[PDB]
Each structure stands twice: as structure tokens, then as C-alpha cells.
């Protein structure tokens, strides 16, 4: 309704609402659909600057959590290519490290990384429970493969 | 048999493998209202690949791997070009492959294992699990081989035709040159640019 | 009881084991139609493992573990031979 409105600001507001909600709720491919909006309406607006990193992260944690890391790594070449303040942000390089520790299937490095990008930016209540879910997947197929 | 069959252009969407051991084929899953059984078809005028019917895969649609899209960097929703290919007609007389060289890669860096891999037995499963199919340099596989994962990437490849006892030909890096695989090529295979296979 | 049971030599496709608690037996799991139950098998001529019936694996196929084919040397989808075996004789 806010969207209908051109009222971007709000329509913003309750799709990060509504796309956390999913993503808690293992709804994960629907709230990086949403992450996708937030990313798209956010371009090229300067006072969205600092939320378009936070997008761009959530997104591709989503992606992790869903298994397709593939879609987490286009994310991460989109939003460097996209916008330079993410591409030299901390969080494109901790979603790089987190792709590049669930490709080896290392949850023990991806718990480092998470430490060291809590250490410098604290991982809110939400990052922690997603990042907690992709750990559970890479551990569970180390556990198939064995 | 490839002398007829239709050779209309389809637009195609990429989506993901429909399990594992399609992969493992690593041919193009296409469903039989598509094209036919067993035949080759090229995507985009550069990419070759050995169709075979799935029932899984709605008409209208191409099934692709992880290391195709690797290999042309595409996109999961992207659309492809999708027309016959005839490799005889195109070549002319360098049908077949007489040496062609595969770089060897741990597709999971902590999977490296310390065992002795016999190239003689990597030839005989890369034949025994791809016959007659068409292959280019810098064309990327996954391999199994005795529960072990491996990209292999087809560094450079040279063509040459029946009847030449010599393989005078240049070998030929560009992605131009195609042929089919033969229970006689000259495999050689390299380490991987991360250098772990031993 | 080993006295009777069918020696004839079948070639089975190795597998990954359907899942953590068939492999935690480490006996061959093996469908009805393939050989009867609670029997010493011996594979290859050295590999000795101890039969289970199993619904979820077809005639004509048997399961094995990460282990064994470490011990082995084995692939997925490798041919082996199975046949009785009968360690008091």
C-alpha cells in the first residue's frame, strides 16, 4: 500500500519487517526476493546508503541458509559491482568469507569469521540465528559425507 | 543419428540440476517434446552438450550444472539460445580427439587426500563414463572417483581426423577446435592451479 | 545356521550407505531376493561382513560405507563379487 503511495521510505520500512520476519521463519528464497526489492528501491538513494550494505548481507545470509551458495556469491558480485561503498564494505567481505567457508565446508573458519565481524560490527539477534542455521547445514553434510 | 532432425533456434532457462547424478552426466537434461535422444546441440553458438529425455524437466526448459555456469558465467532464470549442432560439417576432417590435456582440481580444499590416482584409471572412467561426446578447452567437469570430487578442466585440446598416423596438427588452446572423445586419445593430466592433487 | 544357502557368485554395484545407522551396523545390508539373513558373506575373496534384509535396497545391489571402501579401495558404482562364505571350514 505504502509502494502504491510512492511513499518509499515506509513501503522500505515494512518490507525489512516483513522479509525478517520470513527469513526467521526458514522462509529464506521469499525473504531474499524481499532483500532483492529492498536492494532495487534503495539504488542511487543517498540517504539509503548505509541500509544498502545491511541489504545486500541479508540477502546472500538468506541464500547461505537456503543451501545456494551460488546465489549468495551473485549477490556478492552484484553489490560490489552495483555500489562501491559495499564493494570496499566490511560486510561484502564477511559474506565473502562465509561463501567461501560454506564451499569448503568449514563451519569451524565460519565461526572465526563470524567472531572476528562481531568483534568490529556486532552481529545482531537476527544474523546470529541465520548465521546459526548455515552452520547447522555445512555440519550436517560433513556428517552425510561421513 | 544426426543426418534430420530439427534445428530451430529455442530461447531456454537455466535453472538447477535436477539432482546429482544428472550432474555427474553432464549432459543437458531435455524433455521429449524438446529435441530428440542422444544427440548434440549447441547453446549460444559455443557451448556443446549430449541431450537426453527427462520427464522432469518441463518442455521449454534446460537443466545446467554448477561448472557450465561457471563455465559461461551464467545466471539461475537466465535465458540461452539453444539450436542443433553438427560438429562433422563444421570441422570437416578433424573429428576426433588425438591429445588432450586436463588440469585436475580438489573441488573442496578440505577433501584433499594423500592417495595415488592412476591416470591410466582416470582415462578409463572419463571413456567409460563419456563416450562420443563433444568437448572444447576451457570446459569444466565434475568427476567421481572413488567417492572423490574433482573439477577437471579441459586446458587445451587438439583435433585431428582418422587416417593420420602422425598427429601433425597443432594443438590448439582456442575454444574454436572440438572433437570426439575415442577409446585411444592421449589423456595427460596436470595439477589444478591450487596444486593439491597428487 | 550356515549349513544351506545358495554360494552362487553375484556381481553388485557399491552404493552410499542409505543412512547413518545402516553404516554404524557395519554389516552388509541386502534386499531379500539377494541373500537370507544374519550369514557371513565374503566379498572379493577378502572382505567378510555379516547380512541384514533391507526393503530400501534393490536386487542386486549392496551397501557400503565410507570406511570400507577406504579398507577396499572401492568407488560408488564399482562392480564387486559377492558370494558365501564360511569361515569354519
Known amino acids: 500500500w505504502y509502494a502504491q503511495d510512492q511513499s518509499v521510505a515506509l513501503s522500505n520500512k515494512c518490507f525489512i519487517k516483513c522479509a525478517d520476519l520470513k527469513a526467521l521463519d526458514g522462509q529464506y528464497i521469499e525473504a531474499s526476493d524481499i532483500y532483492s526489492k529492498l536492494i532495487k528501491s534503495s539504488m542511487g538513494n543517498r540517504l539509503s546508503q548505509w541500509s544498502l550494505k545491511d541489504y545486500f548481507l541479508k540477502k546472500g545470509l538468506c541464500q547461505l541458509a537456503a543451501t545456494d551458495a551460488v546465489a549468495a556469491a551473485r549477490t556478492l558480485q552484484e553489490g560490489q559491482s552495483e555500489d562501491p561503498n559495499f564493494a570496499d564494505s566490511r560486510e561484502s567481505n564477511f559474506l565473502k568469507s562465509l561463501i567461501d567457508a560454506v564451499n569448503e565446508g568449514d563451519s569451524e573458519q565460519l565461526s572465526e569469521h563470524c567472531k572476528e565481524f562481531d568483534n568490529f560490527m556486532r552481529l545482531d539477534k537476527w544474523k546470529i540465528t541465520i548465521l546459526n542455521k548455515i552452520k547447522e547445514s555445512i555440519q550436517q553434510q560433513e556428517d552425510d559425507l561421513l | ?198
Open chain 2, 1 to 198: 543419428d544426426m543426418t534430420n532432425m530439427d534445428t530451430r533456434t529455442r530461447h531456454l532457462k537455466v535453472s538447477n540440476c535436477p539432482n546429482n547424478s544428472y550432474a555427474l552426466a553432464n549432459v543437458a537434461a531435455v524433455s521429449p517434446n524438446d529435441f530428440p535422444n542422444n544427440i548434440y546441440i549447441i547453446i549460444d553458438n559455443l557451448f556443446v552438450f549430449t541431450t537426453r529425455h527427462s520427464n522432469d524437466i518441463p518442455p521449454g526448459t534446460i537443466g545446467f550444472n554448477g561448472n557450465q555456469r561457471t563455465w559461461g558465467g551464467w545466471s539461475l532464470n537466465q535465458d540461452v539460445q539453444a539450436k542443433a549442432f553438427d560438429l562433422f560439417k563444421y570441422s570437416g576432417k578433424q573429428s576426433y580427439l588425438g591429445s588432450i590435456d586436463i588440469d585436475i582440481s580438489f573441488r573442496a580444499r578440505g577433501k584433499a587426500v594423500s592417495t595415488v590416482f592412476d591416470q591410466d584409471e582416470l582415462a578409463k572412467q572419463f571413456v567409460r563414463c563419456y563416450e562420443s561426446q563433444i568437448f572444447s578447452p576451457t570446459q569444466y567437469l565434475i568427476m567421481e572417483f572413488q567417492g572423490h570430487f574433482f573439477d577437471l578442466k579441459i586446458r587445451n585440446v587438439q583435433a585431428i581426423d582418422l587416417g593420420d598416423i602422425e598427429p601433425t596438427s597443432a594443438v590448439a588452446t582456442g575454444i574454436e577446435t572440438k572433437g570426439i572423445l575415442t577409446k585411444q586419445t592421449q589423456i595427460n593430466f596436470f595439477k589444478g592451479r591450487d596444486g593439491l592433487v597428487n
